[PDB]
Coordinates of C-alpha atoms in Angstrom, one line a residue:
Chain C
X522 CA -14.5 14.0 11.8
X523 CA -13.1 15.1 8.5
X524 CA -14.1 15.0 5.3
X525 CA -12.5 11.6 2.9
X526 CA -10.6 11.9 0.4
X527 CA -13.1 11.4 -2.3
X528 CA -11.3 12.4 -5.7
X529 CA -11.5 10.5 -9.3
X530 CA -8.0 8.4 -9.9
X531 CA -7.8 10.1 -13.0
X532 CA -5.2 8.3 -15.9
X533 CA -2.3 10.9 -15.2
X534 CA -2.3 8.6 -11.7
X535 CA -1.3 5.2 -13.6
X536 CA 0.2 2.9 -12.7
X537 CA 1.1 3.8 -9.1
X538 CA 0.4 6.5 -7.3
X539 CA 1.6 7.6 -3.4
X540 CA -1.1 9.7 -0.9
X541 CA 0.6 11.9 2.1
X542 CA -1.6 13.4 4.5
X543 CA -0.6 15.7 6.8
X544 CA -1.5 18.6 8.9
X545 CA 0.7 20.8 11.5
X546 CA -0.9 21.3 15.2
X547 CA 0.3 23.6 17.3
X548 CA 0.4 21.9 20.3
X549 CA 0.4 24.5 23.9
X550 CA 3.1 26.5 21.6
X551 CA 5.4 24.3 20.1
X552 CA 3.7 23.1 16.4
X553 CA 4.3 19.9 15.1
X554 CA 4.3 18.4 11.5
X555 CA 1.9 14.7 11.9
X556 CA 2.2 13.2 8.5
X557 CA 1.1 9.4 7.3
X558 CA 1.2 7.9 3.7
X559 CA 0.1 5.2 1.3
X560 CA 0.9 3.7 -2.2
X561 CA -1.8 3.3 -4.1
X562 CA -1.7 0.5 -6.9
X563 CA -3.3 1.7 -10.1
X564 CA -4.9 0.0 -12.9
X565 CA -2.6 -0.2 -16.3
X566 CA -4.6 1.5 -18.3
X567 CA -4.0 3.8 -21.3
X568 CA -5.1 7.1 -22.3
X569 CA -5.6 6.4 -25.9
X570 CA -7.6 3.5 -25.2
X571 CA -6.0 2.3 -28.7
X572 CA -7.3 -0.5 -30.5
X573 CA -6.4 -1.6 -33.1
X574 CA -8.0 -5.3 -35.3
X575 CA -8.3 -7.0 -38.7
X576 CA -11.2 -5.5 -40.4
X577 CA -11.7 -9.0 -42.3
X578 CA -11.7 -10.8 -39.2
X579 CA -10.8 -14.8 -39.4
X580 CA -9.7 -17.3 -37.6
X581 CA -6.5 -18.4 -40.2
X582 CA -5.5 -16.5 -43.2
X583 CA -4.3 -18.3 -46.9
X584 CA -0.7 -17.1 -47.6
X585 CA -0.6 -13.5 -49.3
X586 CA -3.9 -13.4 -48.6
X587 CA -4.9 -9.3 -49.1
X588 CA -6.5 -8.1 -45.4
X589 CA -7.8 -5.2 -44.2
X590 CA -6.7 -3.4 -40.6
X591 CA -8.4 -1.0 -38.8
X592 CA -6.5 1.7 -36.0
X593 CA -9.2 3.3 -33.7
X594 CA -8.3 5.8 -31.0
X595 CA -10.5 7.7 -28.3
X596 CA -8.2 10.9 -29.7
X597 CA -6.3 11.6 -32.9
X598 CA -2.5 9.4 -32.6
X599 CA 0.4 8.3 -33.7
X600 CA 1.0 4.7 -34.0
X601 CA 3.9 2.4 -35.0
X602 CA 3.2 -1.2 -36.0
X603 CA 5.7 -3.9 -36.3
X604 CA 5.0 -7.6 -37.5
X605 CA 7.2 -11.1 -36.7
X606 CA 7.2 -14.5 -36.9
X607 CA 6.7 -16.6 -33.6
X608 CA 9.7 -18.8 -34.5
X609 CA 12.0 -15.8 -34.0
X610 CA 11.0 -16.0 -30.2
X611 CA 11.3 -19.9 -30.2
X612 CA 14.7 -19.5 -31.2
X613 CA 15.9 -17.9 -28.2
X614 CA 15.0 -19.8 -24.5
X615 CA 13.5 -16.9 -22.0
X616 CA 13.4 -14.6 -24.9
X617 CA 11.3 -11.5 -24.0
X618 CA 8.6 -9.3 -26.1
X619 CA 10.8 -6.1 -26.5
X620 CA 7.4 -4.4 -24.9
X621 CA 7.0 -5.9 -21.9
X622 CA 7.5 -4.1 -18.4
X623 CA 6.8 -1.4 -19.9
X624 CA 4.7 0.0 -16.8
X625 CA 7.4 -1.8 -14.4
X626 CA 9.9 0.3 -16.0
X627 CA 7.9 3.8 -16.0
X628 CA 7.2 2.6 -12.2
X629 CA 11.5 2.9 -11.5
X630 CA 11.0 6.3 -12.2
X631 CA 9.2 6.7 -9.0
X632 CA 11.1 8.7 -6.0
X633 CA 9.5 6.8 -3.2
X634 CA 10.0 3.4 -1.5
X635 CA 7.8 0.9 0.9
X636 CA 4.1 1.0 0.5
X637 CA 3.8 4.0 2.8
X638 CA 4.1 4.9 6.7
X639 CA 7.5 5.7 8.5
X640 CA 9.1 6.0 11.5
X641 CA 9.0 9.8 11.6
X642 CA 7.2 12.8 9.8
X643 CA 10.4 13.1 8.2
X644 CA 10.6 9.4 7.6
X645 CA 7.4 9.8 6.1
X646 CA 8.0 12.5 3.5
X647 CA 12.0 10.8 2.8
X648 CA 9.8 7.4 1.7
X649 CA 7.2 9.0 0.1
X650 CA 9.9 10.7 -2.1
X651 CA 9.4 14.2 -0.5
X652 CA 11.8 16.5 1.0
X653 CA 10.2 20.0 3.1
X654 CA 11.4 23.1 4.4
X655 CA 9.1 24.3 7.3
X656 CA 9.8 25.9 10.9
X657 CA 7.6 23.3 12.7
X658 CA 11.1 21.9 14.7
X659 CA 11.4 18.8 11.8
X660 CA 14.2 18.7 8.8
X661 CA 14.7 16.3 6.1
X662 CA 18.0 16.2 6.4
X663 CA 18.1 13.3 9.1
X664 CA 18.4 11.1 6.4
X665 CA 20.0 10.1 3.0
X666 CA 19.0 8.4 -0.3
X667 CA 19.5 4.9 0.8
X668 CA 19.6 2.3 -1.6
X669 CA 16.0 1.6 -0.8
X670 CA 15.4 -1.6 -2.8
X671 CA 11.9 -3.1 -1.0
X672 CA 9.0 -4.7 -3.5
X673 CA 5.8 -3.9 -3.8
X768 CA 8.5 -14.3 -49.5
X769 CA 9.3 -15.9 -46.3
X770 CA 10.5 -12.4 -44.3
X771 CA 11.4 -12.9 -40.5
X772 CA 9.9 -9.4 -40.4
X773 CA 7.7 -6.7 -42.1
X774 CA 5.1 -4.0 -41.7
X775 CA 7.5 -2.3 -40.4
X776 CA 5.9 1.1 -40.0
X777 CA 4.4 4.5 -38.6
X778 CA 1.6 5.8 -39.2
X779 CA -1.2 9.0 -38.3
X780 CA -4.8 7.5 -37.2
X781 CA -6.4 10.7 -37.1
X782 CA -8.9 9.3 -34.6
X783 CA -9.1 6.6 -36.7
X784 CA -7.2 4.5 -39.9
X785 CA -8.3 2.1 -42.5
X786 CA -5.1 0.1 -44.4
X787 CA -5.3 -2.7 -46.7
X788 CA -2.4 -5.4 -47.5
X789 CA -1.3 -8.5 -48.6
X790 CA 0.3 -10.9 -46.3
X791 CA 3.4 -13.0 -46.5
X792 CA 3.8 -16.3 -48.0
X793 CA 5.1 -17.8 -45.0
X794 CA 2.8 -20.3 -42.8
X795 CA 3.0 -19.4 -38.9
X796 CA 1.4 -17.3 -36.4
X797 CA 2.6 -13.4 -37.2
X798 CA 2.8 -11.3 -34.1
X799 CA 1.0 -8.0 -35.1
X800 CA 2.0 -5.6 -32.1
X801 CA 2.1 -1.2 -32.2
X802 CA 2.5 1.4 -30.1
X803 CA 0.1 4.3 -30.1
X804 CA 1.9 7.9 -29.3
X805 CA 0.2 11.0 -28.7
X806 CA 0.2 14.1 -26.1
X807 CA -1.8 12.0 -24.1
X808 CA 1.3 9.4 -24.1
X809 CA 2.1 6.2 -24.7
X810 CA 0.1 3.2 -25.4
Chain B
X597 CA 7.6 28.2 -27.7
X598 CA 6.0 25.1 -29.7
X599 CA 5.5 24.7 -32.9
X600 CA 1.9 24.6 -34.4
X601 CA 0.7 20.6 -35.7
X602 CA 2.9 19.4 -38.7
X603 CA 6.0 21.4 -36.8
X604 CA 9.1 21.3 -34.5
X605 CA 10.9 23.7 -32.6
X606 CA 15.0 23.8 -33.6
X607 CA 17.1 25.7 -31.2
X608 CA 16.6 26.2 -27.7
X609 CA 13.1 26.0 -27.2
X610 CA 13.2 28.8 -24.8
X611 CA 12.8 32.6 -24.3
X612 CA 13.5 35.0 -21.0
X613 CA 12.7 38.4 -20.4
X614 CA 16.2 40.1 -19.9
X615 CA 16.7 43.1 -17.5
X616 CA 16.4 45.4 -20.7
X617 CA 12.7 44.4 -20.6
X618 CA 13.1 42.6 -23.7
X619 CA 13.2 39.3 -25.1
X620 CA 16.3 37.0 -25.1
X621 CA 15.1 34.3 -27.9
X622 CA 17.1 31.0 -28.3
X623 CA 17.8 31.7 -31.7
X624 CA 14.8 29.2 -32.2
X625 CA 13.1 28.1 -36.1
X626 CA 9.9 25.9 -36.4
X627 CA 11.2 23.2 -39.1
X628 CA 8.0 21.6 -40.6
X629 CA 7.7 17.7 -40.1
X630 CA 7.5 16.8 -43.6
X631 CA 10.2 15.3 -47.0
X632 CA 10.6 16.7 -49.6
X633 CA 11.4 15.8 -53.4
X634 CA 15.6 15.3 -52.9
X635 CA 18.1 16.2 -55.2
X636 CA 17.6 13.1 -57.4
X637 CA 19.9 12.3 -60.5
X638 CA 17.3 13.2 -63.0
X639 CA 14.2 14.8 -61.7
X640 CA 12.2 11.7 -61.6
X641 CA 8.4 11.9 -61.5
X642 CA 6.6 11.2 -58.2
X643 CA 3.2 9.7 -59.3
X644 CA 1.5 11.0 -55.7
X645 CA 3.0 14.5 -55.8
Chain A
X175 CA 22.2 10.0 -34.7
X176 CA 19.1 11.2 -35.4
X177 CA 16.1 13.4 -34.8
X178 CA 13.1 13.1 -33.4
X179 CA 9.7 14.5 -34.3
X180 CA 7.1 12.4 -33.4
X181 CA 8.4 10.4 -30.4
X182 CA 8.8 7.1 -32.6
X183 CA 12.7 7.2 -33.5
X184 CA 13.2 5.4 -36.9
X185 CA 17.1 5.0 -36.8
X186 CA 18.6 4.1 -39.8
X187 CA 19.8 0.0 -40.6
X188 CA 22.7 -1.0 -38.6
X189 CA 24.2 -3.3 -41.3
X190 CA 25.9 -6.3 -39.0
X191 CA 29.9 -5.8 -39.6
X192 CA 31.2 -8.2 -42.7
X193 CA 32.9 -10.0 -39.4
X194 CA 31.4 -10.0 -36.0
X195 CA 32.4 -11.9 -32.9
X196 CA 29.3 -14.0 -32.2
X197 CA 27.3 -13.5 -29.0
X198 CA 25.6 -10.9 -27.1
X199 CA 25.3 -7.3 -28.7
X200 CA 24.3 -4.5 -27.1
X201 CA 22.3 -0.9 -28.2
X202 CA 23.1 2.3 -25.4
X203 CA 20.7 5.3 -26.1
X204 CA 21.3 8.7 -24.9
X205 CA 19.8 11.5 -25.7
X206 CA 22.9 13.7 -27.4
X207 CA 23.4 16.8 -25.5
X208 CA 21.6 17.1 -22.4
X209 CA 20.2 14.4 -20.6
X210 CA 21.5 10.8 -19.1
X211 CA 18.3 8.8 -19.5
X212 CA 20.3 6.2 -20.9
X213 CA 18.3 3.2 -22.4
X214 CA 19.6 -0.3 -23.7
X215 CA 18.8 -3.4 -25.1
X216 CA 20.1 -6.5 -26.0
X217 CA 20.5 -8.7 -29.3
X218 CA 22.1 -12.2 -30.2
X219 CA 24.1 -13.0 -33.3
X220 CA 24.3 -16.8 -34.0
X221 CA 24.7 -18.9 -36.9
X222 CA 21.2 -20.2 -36.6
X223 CA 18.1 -22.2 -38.5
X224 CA 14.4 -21.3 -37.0
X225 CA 13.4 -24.3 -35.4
X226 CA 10.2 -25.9 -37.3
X227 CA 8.2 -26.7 -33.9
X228 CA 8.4 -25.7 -30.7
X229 CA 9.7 -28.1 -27.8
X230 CA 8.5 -27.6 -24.0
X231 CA 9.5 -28.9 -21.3
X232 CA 8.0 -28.8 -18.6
Chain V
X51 CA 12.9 63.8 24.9
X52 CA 13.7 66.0 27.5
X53 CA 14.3 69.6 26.4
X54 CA 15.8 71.0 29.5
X55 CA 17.1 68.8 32.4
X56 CA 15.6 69.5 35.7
X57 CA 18.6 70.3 37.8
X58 CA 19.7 71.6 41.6
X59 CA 16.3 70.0 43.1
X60 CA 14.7 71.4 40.6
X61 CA 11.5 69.4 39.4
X62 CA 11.5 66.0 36.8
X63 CA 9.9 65.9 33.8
X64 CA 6.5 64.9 34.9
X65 CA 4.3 62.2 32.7
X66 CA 5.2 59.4 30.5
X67 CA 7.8 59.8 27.7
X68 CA 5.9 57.7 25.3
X69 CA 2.8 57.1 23.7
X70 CA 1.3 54.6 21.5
X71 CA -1.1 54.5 18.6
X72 CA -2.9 51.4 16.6
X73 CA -1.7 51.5 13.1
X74 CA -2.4 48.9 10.0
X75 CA 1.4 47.7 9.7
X76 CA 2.5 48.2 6.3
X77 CA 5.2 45.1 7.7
X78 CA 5.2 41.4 8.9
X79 CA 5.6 39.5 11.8
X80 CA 8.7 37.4 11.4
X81 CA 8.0 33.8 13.0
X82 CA 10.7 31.9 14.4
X83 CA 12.7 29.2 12.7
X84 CA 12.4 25.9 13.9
X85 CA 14.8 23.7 16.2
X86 CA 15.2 21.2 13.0
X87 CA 17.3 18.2 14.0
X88 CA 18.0 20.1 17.1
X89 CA 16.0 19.7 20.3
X90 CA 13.7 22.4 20.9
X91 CA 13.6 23.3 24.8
X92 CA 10.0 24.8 25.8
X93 CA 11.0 28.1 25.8
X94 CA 11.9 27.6 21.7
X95 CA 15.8 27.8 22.7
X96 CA 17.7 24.9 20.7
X97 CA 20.2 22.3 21.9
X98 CA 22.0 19.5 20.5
X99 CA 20.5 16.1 20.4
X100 CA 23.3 14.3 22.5
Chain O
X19 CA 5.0 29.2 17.5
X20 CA 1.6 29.2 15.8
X21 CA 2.3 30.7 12.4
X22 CA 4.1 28.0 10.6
X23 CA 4.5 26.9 7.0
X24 CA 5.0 23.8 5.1
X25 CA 6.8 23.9 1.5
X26 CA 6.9 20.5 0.0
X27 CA 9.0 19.4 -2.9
X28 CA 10.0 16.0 -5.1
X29 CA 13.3 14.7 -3.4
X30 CA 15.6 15.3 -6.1
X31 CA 14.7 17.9 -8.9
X32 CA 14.5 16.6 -12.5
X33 CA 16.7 19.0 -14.9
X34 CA 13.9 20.3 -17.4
X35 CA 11.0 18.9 -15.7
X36 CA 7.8 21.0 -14.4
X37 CA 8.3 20.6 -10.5
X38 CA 4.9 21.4 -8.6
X39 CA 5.6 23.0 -5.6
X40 CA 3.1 23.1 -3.1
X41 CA 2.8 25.8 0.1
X42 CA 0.9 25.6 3.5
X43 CA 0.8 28.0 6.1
X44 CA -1.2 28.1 9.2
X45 CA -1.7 31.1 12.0
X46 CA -2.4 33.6 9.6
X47 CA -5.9 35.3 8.4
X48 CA -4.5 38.4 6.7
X49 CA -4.3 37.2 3.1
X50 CA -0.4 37.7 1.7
X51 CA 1.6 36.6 -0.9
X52 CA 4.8 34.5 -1.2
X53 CA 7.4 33.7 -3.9
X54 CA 9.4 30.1 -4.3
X55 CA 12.4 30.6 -6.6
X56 CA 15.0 27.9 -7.8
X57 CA 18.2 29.8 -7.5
X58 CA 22.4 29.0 -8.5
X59 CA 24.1 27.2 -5.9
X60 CA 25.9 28.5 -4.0
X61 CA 25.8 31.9 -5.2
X62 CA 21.9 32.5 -5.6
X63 CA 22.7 34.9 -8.2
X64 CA 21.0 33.3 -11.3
X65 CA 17.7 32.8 -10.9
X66 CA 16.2 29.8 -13.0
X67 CA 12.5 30.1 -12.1
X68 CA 9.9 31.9 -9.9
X69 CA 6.4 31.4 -8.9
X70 CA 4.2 34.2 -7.7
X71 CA 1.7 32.2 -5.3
X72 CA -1.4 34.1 -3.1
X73 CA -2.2 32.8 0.2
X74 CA -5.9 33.7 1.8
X75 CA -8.5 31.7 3.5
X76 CA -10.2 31.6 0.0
X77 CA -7.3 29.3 -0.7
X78 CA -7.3 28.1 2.6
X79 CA -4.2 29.1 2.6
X80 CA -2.9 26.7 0.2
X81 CA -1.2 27.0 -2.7
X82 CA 1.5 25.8 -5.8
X83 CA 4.2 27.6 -8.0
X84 CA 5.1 25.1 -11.1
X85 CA 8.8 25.7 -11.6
X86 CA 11.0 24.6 -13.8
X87 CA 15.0 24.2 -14.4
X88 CA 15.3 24.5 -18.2
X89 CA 18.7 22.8 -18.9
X90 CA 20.6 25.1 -20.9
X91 CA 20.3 28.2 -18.2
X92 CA 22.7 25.9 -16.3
X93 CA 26.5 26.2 -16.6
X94 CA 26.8 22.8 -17.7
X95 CA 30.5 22.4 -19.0
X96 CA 32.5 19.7 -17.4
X97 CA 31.3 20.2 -14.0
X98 CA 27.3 19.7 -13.9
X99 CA 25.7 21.5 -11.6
X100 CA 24.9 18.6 -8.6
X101 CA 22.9 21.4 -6.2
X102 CA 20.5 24.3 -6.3
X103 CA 18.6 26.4 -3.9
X104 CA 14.8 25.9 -3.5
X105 CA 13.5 29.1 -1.9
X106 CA 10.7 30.7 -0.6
X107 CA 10.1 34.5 0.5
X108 CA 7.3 36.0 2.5
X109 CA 6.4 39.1 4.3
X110 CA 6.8 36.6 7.6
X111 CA 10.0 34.2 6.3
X112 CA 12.5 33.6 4.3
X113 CA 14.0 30.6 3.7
X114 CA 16.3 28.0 1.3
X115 CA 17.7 24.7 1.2
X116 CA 20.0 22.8 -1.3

């Protein structure tokens, strides 16, 4: 029996990432290419492992109430930090957070289809996104890229803003005058990505 | 090429070793990421200069 | 157009036209030269009032 | 090779005209290509499918 | 038909991305080296990139070239270019596909 595949999922693997195994045996004399595969679903996770809080934490602020905000990063990042009114959403029915699917979308990027298997070494490596050259008597070109579709004051707005944490940020400001819930929300960028 | 922090590469970001064993370069500057003091009507100070 | 250097794109103010037809705008980004990797989005322009509280139905 | 040709009866060339020696081959072994989408027959001689 | 290879590659090639191509052969003790190129289509005259990998037992014979298609070595102009030759080259084989 064979060793497992023990290996650490490390963060370049988020959110999804597809295993192929294969081997080619010989047979008497003619070799064949045996290949199986698997997505694996992956934990959303970051790399910057940003955080970000009010220093002065409360449960309600007083109108133009000065507050301080604090940016802390496992490395050195960019961030962008954008601030509106919950209202603006209630206007519109079904209105969507500009930042969602944010991982769903990064997921379309993904050559492969089905959650793994196939009907065919070939198969296998077409789903899993793969195309080979090799002499063992199998060639991708059997098939085509099917449209493979399976499923696995009184602002509106402010703070408007970017900003270097070098690992990490202190900022101080005063609020608006308007009475609400603000949606604080920011986007930390860096080598290491997005967050 | 890159850039070192607080730069960008302008041009083609690329080089090749041509078949006169030298380098091709893509005509390629490193612009630093900063502003500067514009053109402004009448010099006006900047208090954090 | 502009330039990036960071990875956070900070376009310039689209000032809404002094007439627009009403309804659903859309942004296309491309990157200029190069590349397809064409993103969009969507935004509404209404005459409209914030509601004062929210309403669900449920 | 032969030098002179035996001739009128007179005698062949006697012995092998060859001889081997081990080497360390400066080249490589070409392998074979595969049948592909074709069917391989055992031999490794490809046919059409249908 | 013991000496076989696999070379494995992304279905479609991403202009400008760093493509990881990965190389198995089997049959074969002698250590030796092998070169995967990206290559013009059809003409496999321009070159865009080339990886040197070494194949011995103290890679099990295993290995991965990380090539690239850098976009402005392409002809671009009206006509993108829609194919390229992935290739690899050995003392045993040779071979390409679109």
């Amino acid at each position: 029996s064979y060793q497992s595949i023990n290996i650490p999922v490390t963060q370049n693997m988020v959110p999804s990432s597809r295993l192929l195994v294969y081997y080619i045996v010989t047979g008497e004399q003619t070799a064949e290419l045996v290949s199986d595969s698997v997505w694996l679903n992956i934990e959303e996770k970051c790399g910057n492992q940003l955080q970000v809080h009010l220093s002065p934490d409360a449960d309600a602020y007083s109108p133009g109430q000065t507050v301080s905000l604090n940016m802390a990063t496992g490395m050195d990042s960019w961030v962008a930090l954008a601030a509106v009114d919950s209202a603006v959403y209630g206007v519109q029915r079904g209105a969507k957070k500009p930042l969602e699917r944010v991982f769903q979308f990064l997921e379309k990027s993904d050559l492969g289809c089905g959650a793994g298997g196939g009907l065919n070494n070939a198969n296998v490596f077409h789903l899993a996104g793969l195309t080979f050259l090799t002499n063992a008597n199998a060639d991708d070109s059997q098939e085509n890229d099917e449209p493979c579709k399976e499923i696995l004051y009184f602002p509106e707005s402010w703070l408007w803003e970017v900003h270097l944490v070098p690992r990490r940020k202190q900022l101080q400001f005063a609020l608006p005058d308007s009475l609400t819930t603000w949606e604080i929300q920011g986007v930390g960028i860096s080598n290491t990505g997005i967050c | 090429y890159t850039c070192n922090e607080g730069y960008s590469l302008i041009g083609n970001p690329v080089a090749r070793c041509g078949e006169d064993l030298r380098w091709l370069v893509g005509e390629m500057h490193c612009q630093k990421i900063a502003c500067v003091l514009p053109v402004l009507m009448d010099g006006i100070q900047s208090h954090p200069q | 157009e502009e330039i990036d250097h960071i990875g956070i794109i900070s376009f310039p103010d689209f000032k809404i036209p002094s007439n627009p037809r009403y309804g659903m705008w859309t942004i296309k980004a491309k990157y200029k030269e190069d590349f397809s990797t064409t993103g969009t989005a969507y935004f509404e322009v209404k005459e409209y009032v914030l509601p004062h509280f929210s309403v669900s139905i449920e | 090779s032969v030098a002179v040709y035996g001739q009128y009866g007179g005698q062949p060339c006697v012995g092998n005209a060859f001889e081997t020696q081990s080497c360390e081959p400066t080249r490589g072994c070409p392998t074979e290509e595969g049948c592909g989408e074709r069917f391989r027959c055992f031999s490794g001689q490809c046919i059409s499918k249908s | 038909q013991e000496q076989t290879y696999v070379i494995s590659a992304p279905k479609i090639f991403r202009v400008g991305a760093s493509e990881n191509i990965v190389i198995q052969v089997y049959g074969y003790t002698e250590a030796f080296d092998a070169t995967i190129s990206i290559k013009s289509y059809p003409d496999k005259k321009f070159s865009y990139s080339s990886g040197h990998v070494h194949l011995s037992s103290e890679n099990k014979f295993q290995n991965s070239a990380i090539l690239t298609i850098q976009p402005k070595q392409l002809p671009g102009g009206q006509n993108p270019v829609s194919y390229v030759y992935l290739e690899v080259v050995s003392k045993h084989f040779s071979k390409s596909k679109r």
